[PDB]
Design a protein around this ligand. Structure first.
Ligand SMILES: [Mg+2]
Ligand SMILES: [Mg+2]
Ligand SMILES: [Mg+2]
Ligand SMILES: [Mg+2]
Ligand SMILES: [Mg+2]
Ligand SMILES: [Mg+2]
Ligand SMILES: [Mg+2]
Ligand SMILES: [Mg+2]
Ligand SMILES: [Mg+2]
Ligand SMILES: [Mg+2]
Ligand SMILES: [Mg+2]
Ligand SMILES: [Mg+2]
Ligand SMILES: [Mg+2]
Ligand SMILES: [Mg+2]
Ligand SMILES: [Mg+2]
Ligand SMILES: [Mg+2]
Ligand SMILES: [Zn+2]
Lengths: 72, 106, 61, 98, 85, 140, 247
RNA sequence: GAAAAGUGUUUAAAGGGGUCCCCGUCUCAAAAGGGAAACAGGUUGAUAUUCCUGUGCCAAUAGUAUUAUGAGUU
RNA sequence: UUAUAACAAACCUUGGAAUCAAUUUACUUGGAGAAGAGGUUCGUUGAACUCAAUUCAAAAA
RNA sequence: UUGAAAAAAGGAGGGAACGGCUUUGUGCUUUGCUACUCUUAAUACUUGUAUG
RNA sequence: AAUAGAUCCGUAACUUCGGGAAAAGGAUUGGCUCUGAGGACAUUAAUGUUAACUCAGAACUGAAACGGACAAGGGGAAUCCGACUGUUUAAUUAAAACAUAGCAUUGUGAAAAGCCACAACUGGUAUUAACACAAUGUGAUUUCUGCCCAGUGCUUUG
RNA sequence: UUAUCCAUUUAUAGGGAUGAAUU
């Protein structure tokens, strides 16, 4: 499992066709934190956002053939 | 205390079967087998450890990226810098001496 | 046990009669020496760094 | 007798004169051209000795193979550490240059 | 306080083994555990590894030599003869 | 005297250029906040001309005797100076330029240097010993 | 009766050598064109313990004259050899401690070791720690040379036979008492199982000529003929004299 | 050696690596030596580092042809 | 190659040491280059460290 | 008493060999043009069914 | 049975000067309430936050008791044997037997040697080489080891 | 010396004057 910090890199990864599923998790922080996981054939890449709206926007951006798993 | 047991087949306290007791998310204390500490790769002359080489076991050395095995000198990851220097000096100076000897003869 | 430990902290149960290990077993002479030397040497190092003591003096001390 | 003379000369240099001992300093001196004469102990490890010789040749400096050990070369000078090679960069009253 | 008068290195042996034997050991143990003068680096660092093998700590040059001393007399004599030749 | 005069050939002792032989072009010997050490600036050969037979064809010979060069500023304490001096057989100022060490097209400069070296090897003159020395790969 | 301890040794079962940790056989160079007509120099790359031996070994590396590659010999180290010393071997070698020369080319008085008794034998005499032989003469006929072995014995060898100038390392190892039984235990533990030695006189008759009696005594002369058989040859074999040696 | 067996390079024409040369007895012998790679949680009446969920790791992966990925050379 | 941090070592540059110095619980080490100053690496370790991200504001190419 | 070996792996030394396509003559030589040599991953297709 | 743990004291003969030695032989020991000694850090010599556990001393206290159970040498003066640690008759003998270091003797210079094995070849010692291997005896140290070569053995000349 | 015997090595140049070393 890997972490991602460059949003652009994440986007690129998403664009790449072996990325079957996205996992999008909501977490009550000690505000609503959001973890964006992409499930690639090789690795499970995750991005952490402090900011909900940004997270939402990025989710929206994600290709609509991704197999989105809303965990909690 | 939480007690433990070997899980991998080898149930004796050998150098290969050394063990690091580790806490799980479950709360169970488990035993994890430590991969042995490898020997630092050494100089073809003085048998001192060569720098810039990850000391890895022969299994793990095969996988590691070529930068982690090599150093970019001449004799590289087989001879330390000091020794290399000395070798170079020998190669030059002795050659020079030979020439001098020849001159003397003639 | 906690009460006992508190009492020991105030020095209470420690005492000739309540003592079965040799002096070294109770608290190792070697460990005490180590402590002391480390304390002293550290202090010396500090002093020399501050320049409050000169090299020569430090070394002899 | 020769050895004694050499020792005396060394002493003289120490008293009045500019020197510096040990490989690196000596080499530096040679590179500069500041070295007038280098004196090298019997026990100086072969390669380094050779290097020193080469440097001297390049600078047309004298090479003097000191008869005695590392230890002696040091005792010959005022010093309680073993020496190996030293470079006189100015002779005072002393003759050793000639 | 200097602890032992006559014994020195053979205090480890204690009461056991003849006094004569311990005396002999003493010479040899002194010879063994001395740091000898290294003929290359100068430093008195040649201590004994194995029996006839003497490693300088400084330069790491293993000199073959005596079992107890670094140089036996016979060997030295031989060397001298060779030099003369 | 001053051992390392511009044009003298030296053997590098340290670094990636470990046992490579080279010509010094401009000595500095001035310690600074940037480079707190007397340094030499050197133009040398990494990959020497390979051994060649009379039997071989000319193009192939030329290919064989390509000489891959390098330009490196180096601590004088890392170089073994030689008796050999090539102030004559090269216009030395033309080999390496101080200013161009900084510049972007350093690889271009290196290439040019290499070409020059190759040319020199092709036309030796009468035949200097220094140049011969430079030609031969140091075996250690 | 039973088979005596001595007899058991020859079958070599537990009585074989403890060969496991030994570094290899100590041998001179093969006798090549080099060594016969000139000299070859090798580097002593390391000086090492060979367990069951008392004398340290020198791994000496030579460069093979007939194929590109370095090959290692195991020489017995003379005193004064050291790592990074060059050892030279051959007819026209120079006479220095360490070097390997035909006995013909060493003046009288020279001290030698690792001596081949026949040429090519890869060196056989004077190998034990401390020991040396002396060249005592070379005949006016040339050819043979007279040597004096550590025993005292004088022997005549070929002059072409090689040897090593100097004395073998680890001298005087016998000077220091073993003191403890355990140190002897450790000594033989690396050689072969010849230790403890129970006394024949402490055994029963089934076991040993000396065995039995209500007293612990040998009971019959303990000098036995050369021409005895296996279980008889037990006391002082073939003894020319006995008692405290006066000569 | 009558064989059965006894010895294992002692006087061999004893399979591998490269593009003819160069190496070279075979085989078995370690479930504590050497060694490619695994963890957690869950689950059964009875198995689990072996199933389940999840997360990895290791070793392969023939040729030819496209694609992309980056290097290097002009 | 977990990223980094810290630490025992090993090495590099500089520096040039007797009024010897650094230094360990222990002794070890030094003109074959010590201390000091700045680095490199392996090894422990496996999120230590502001570690990473983000918040906006100021200075370079 | 100096404290296994080998499989396996790695590093170094060394400098063997060297672009591709088209045309001509008996794998080699000559003539003309500039995307080449690697590299992982995916994909396709024949070859026994090419993942444990 | 007594002795025993610890702390403090004291510790002889004799000795191979290492030991003997925990010699012998004394004292103290609980609980409570205090006192003193012993660090780290970080402010700026004084003032802070703060940590073990150990030592030493003093009051009071009790049916004079306290290593309160548990656990834990009996010691000395000699003599005999074996120097010692070690090993041994599995299921009656643990020793004074064996071993041991030390000592001394003996053989052997080599693949035609020594010692031993094998039916035979061949092997072991030996990946060895006289400071070695083999074979005996005695059994640390100290101090010595006298006389006898006729008897028997071994051996040297031919 | 040719039988026989022993040794030595990869059966590796016919006899005399502490670098590298291969196509
Ligand atoms: Mg103590
Ligand atoms: Mg005995
Ligand atoms: Mg016995
Ligand atoms: Mg009996
Ligand atoms: Mg009988
Ligand atoms: Mg009896
Ligand atoms: Mg008796
Ligand atoms: Mg098998
Ligand atoms: Mg195993
Ligand atoms: Mg079960
Ligand atoms: Mg006893
Ligand atoms: Mg006992
Ligand atoms: Mg019994
Ligand atoms: Mg007995
Ligand atoms: Mg006695
Ligand atoms: Mg008598
Ligand atoms: Zn080295």
């Amino acid at each position: 499992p890997k972490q991602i910090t460059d949003i652009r890199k994440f986007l690129k990864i998403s664009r790449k066709p072996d990325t079957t599923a996205v996992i999008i998790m909501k977490k009550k922080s000690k505000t609503v934190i959001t973890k964006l996981k992409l499930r690639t054939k090789k690795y499970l890449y995750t991005m952490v956002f402090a900011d909900r709206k940004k997270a939402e926007r990025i989710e929206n951006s994600l290709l609509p053939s991704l197999k989105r798993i809303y965990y909690p | 205390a939480q007690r433990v047991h070997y899980r991998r087949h080898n149930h004796y306290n050998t150098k290969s079967n050394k063990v690091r007791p580790v806490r799980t998310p479950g709360g169970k204390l488990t035993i994890h087998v430590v991969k042995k500490k490898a020997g630092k790769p050494k100089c073809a002359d003085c048998k001192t450890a060569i720098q810039g080489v990850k000391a890895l076991r022969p299994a793990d050395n095969y996988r590691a990226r070529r930068k982690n095995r090599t150093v970019a000198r001449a004799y590289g990851g087989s001879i330390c810098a000091r020794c290399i220097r000395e070798r170079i000096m020998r190669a030059f100076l002795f050659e020079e001496q030979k020439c001098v000897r020849q001159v003397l003869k003639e | 046990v906690r009460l006992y430990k508190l009492a020991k902290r105030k020095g209470r149960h420690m005492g000739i009669g309540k003592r079965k290990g040799t002096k070294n077993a109770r608290t190792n002479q070697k460990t005490l020496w180590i402590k002391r030397q480390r304390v002293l040497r550290r202090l010396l190092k500090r002093l020399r760094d501050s320049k409050k003591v000169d090299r020569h003096l430090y070394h002899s001390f | 007798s020769a050895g004694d003379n050499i020792n005396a000369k060394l002493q003289l240099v120490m008293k009045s004169g500019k020197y510096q001992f040990g490989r690196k300093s000596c080499l530096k001196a040679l590179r500069t051209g500041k070295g007038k004469l280098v004196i090298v102990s019997s026990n100086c490890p072969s390669i380094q000795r050779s290097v020193i010789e080469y440097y001297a040749m390049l600078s047309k400096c004298g090479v003097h193979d000191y008869h005695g050990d590392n230890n002696d070369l040091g005792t010959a000078c005022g010093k309680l550490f073993r020496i190996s090679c030293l470079v006189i960069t100015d002779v005072g009253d002393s003759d050793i240059i000639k | 306080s200097r602890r032992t008068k006559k014994v020195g290195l053979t205090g480890k042996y204690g009461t056991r083994y003849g006094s004569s034997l311990r005396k002999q050991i003493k010479k040899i143990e002194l010879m063994q555990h001395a740091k000898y003068l290294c003929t290359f680096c100068g430093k008195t660092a040649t201590k004994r590894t194995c029996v006839g093998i003497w490693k300088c700590k400084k330069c790491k040059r293993k000199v073959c030599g005596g079992a107890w001393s670094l140089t036996t007399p016979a060997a030295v004599a031989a060397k001298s003869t060779i030099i003369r030749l | 005297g001053k051992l390392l005069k511009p044009g003298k050939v030296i053997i590098i002792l340290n670094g990636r250029r470990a046992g490579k032989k080279a010509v010094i072009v401009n000595t500095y010997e001035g310690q600074t906040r940037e480079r707190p050490y007397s340094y030499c600036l050197v133009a040398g050969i990494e990959k020497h001309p390979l051994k060649v037979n009379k039997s071989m064809t000319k193009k192939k010979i030329v290919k064989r005797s390509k000489v891959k060069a390098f330009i490196k500023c180096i601590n004088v304490n890392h170089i073994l100076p030689t008796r050999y001096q090539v102030a004559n057989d090269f216009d030395i100022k033309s080999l390496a330029s101080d200013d161009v060490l900084k510049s972007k097209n350093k690889k271009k400069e290196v290439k040019k240097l290499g070409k020059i070296f190759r040319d020199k090897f092709l036309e030796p003159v009468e035949v200097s010993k220094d140049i011969s020395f430079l030609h031969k790969k140091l075996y250690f | 009766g039973r088979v005596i301890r001595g007899q058991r040794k020859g079958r070599g079962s537990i009585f074989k050598s403890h060969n496991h940790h030994r570094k290899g056989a100590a041998k001179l160079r093969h006798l090549d064109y080099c060594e016969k007509k000139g000299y070859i120099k090798g580097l002593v790359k390391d000086i090492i313990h060979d367990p069951g031996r008392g004398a340290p070994l020198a791994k000496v590396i030579f460069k093979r004259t007939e194929k590109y590659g370095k090959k290692e010999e195991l020489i017995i180290a003379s005193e004064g050899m050291f790592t990074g010393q060059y050892i030279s071997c051959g007819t026209k070698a120079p006479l220095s401690v360490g070097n390997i020369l035909p006995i013909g080319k060493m003046p009288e008085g020279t001290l030698i070791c690792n001596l081949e008794h026949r040429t090519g034998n890869r060196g056989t005499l004077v190998k034990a720690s401390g020991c040396y032989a002396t060249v005592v003469g070379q005949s006016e006929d040339g050819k043979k040379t007279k040597v004096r072995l550590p025993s005292g014995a004088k022997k005549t060898i070929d002059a072409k036979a090689r040897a090593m100038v100097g004395v073998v390392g680890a001298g005087g190892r016998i000077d220091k008492p073993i003191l403890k039984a355990g140190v002897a235990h450790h000594k033989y533990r690396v050689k072969r199982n010849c230790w403890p030695k129970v006394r024949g006189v402490a055994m029963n008759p089934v076991e040993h000529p000396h065995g039995g009696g209500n007293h612990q005594h040998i009971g019959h002369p303990s000098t036995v003929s050369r021409s005895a058989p296996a279980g008889q040859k037990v006391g002082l074999i073939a003894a020319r004299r006995t008692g405290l040696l006066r000569g």
